[PDB]
């Protein structure tokens, strides 16, 4: 249908981010200035958040055959925009250490934020595909932004080849689904079936190939092997964005797809996702046991945490509180990953050139950077599901949802994987406070420090008193 002005005021985050991309590009074409383009990008993302407020002043409706805007889309749009703003704030000093052009970074961050918003509002297979690609391609650029480095270039090549393979798998899956079901909308996948014939082999095959593509995109086993190499090789703000915004947006569109589709309540797909979640939790927690590099450790951490989220997704159409479980867990995991990768980025900033190493060396961090050590030990405790932290609130949400749906294998998997997580997270958290033998002064570095400090304080306070977050997430309900 046509686009009414009400649909246009519901379009405000997308339009504001697109206008920000155009304005930043024209400012680059005027004169290559790092500070002005960084300011323009962060102004556009903050204006997109205020536009989210103005969207909430309006209603929830289907703006296109493609997009549906509701509180679900608002929550995921807000998470994606917060991740993008944090990525810009962390990337400014790291780009201050850079030699080449340093505004295409902000252009790509804006375009990937736009793709995240599009995945938040996606109600169509075309919209899902386009949002996935609009996340992926600026990440192809940003992962290999320091292409002179060996690690960054090989991370870029690995991510490019594997994501092109995943997008081809996903696209063939939706081709098979559209061959089975005559409509490409989310609500009509399996509509023309009855008398228990929901297990159409072509529909199941198509959804399996989309499961392959999304399980690449969500770092789910057995499409998980790319995660630590790309996380380690990428620049640290790019690792922040790739851990937070891409995972949040892709998992939101996965939840919306499985909620709206009549084939979401299929026992074959449910058992396959149960196997994938069990393997994801166990494999990520087991593989993060013996990691000395913090970025690979956080990659396997991301695999395990997405396994917990996928466990919460398996109980989507049996329980009722799965939506708010995933929302609470994703807010907590976003703030945890923001704090951890922000500490990593702040001690890897400014950039030291393509020849110098980018090792973190977290041991004895308290004796020269006490505030960042306190922040990172808070985030390490939060990722472990330790009480007095928000990650525990998300963990408790996942456990309650799994218990409610009688998923006892997944509940035991969460228990075991949390024990392994306890081991390696506390190893890092206590290695922060030991004694190290051996191995700034600008307001943007202080801004990044304030960002990770605020994230840690939010994690602590919302771990002690998680009611406001639950209240906010609970009213962010999609269309019934």
């Amino acid at each position: 249908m046509t686009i009414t002005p009400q649909n246009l005021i519901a379009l405000l985050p997308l339009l504001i981010v697109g206008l920000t991309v155009v304005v930043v590009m024209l400012s680059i074409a005027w004169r290559r200035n790092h500070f002005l383009n960084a300011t323009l990008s962060v102004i556009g993302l903050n204006a997109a958040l205020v536009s989210l407020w103005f969207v909430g002043q309006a209603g929830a409706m289907d703006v296109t055959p493609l997009m549906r805007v509701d509180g679900f889309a608002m929550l995921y749009t807000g998470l994606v925009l917060l991740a993008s703003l944090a990525t810009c704030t962390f990337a400014y000093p790291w780009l201050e250490g850079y030699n080449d052009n340093k505004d295409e970074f902000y252009l790509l961050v804006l375009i990937a934020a736009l793709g995240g918003i599009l995945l938040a509002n996606a109600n169509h297979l075309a919209s899902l595909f386009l949002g996935i690609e609009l996340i992926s391609l600026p990440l192809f650029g940003l992962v290999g932004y320091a292409f002179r480095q060996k690690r960054s270039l090989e991370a870029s090549i690995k991510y490019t080849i594997l994501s092109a393979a995943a997008s081809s798998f996903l696209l063939f899956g939706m081709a098979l689904v559209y061959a089975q079901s005559g409509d490409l909308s989310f609500v009509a996948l399996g509509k023309n079936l009855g008398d228990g014939m929901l297990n159409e082999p072509l529909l199941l095959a198509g959804f399996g190939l989309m499961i392959v593509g999304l399980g690449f995109k969500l770092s789910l086993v057995p499409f998980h092997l790319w995660t630590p190499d790309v996380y380690q090789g990428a620049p640290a703000p790019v690792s922040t964005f790739l851990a937070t915004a891409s995972k949040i947006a892709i998992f939101g569109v996965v939840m919306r797809l499985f909620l709206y589709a009549p084939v979401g309540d299929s026992e074959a797909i449910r058992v396959v996702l149960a196997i994938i979640a069990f393997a994801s939790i166990i494999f990520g927690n087991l593989m993060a046991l013996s990691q000395t590099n913090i970025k690979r450790l956080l990659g396997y951490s991301s695999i395990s945490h997405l396994g917990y989220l996928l466990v919460a997704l398996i109980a989507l159409q049996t329980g009722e509180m799965s939506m708010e479980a995933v929302g609470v867990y994703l807010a907590g995991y976003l703030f945890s990953s923001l704090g951890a990768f922000g500490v990593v980025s702040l001690m890897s900033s400014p950039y030291r050139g393509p020849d110098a190493d980018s090792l973190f060396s977290y041991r004895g961090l308290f004796w020269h950077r006490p505030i960042l050590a306190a922040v990172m030990t808070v985030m390490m405790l939060s990722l472990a599901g330790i009480p007095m932290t928000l990650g525990f609130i998300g963990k408790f949400y996942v456990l309650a949802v799994g218990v409610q749906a009688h998923l006892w294998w997944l509940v035991g998997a969460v228990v075991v994987g949390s024990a392994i997580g306890l081991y390696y997270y506390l190893r890092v958290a206590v290695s922060l406070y030991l004694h190290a033998p051996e191995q700034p002064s600008n307001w943007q570095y202080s801004a990044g420090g304030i960002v990770v400090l605020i994230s840690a304080l939010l994690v602590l306070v919302l771990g002690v008193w998680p009611q406001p977050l639950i209240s906010i997430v609970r009213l962010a309900m999609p269309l019934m």
């Binding site: 686009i3 155009v22 590009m25 024209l26 074409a29 005027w30 290559r32 052009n101």
Partner: protein, 101 residues
Amino acid sequence: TSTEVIAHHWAFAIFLIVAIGLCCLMLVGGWFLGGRALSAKFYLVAMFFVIFDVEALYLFAWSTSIRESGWVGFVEAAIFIFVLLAGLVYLVRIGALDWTP
């Protein structure tokens, strides 16, 4: 299944077949008869051609249905064309398309 459409199909087939056969047979007559005895700016311009050709195909799809899309389609294609022109101006100004620096 009219006689005009099948006549045009056979005429087009005969045109293609006779043309390619004429080129191939004249090369065969040439061969059989007669006795015997880098810079990366090129990648940049080819890449720009690829991207701008895909945006061109979008305008190809738009142009054949300008009447049926109305002024709303004009606004959408104007936004498309403005984004395309902003990218082109960016490429021109930051020296991607300047062949002699």
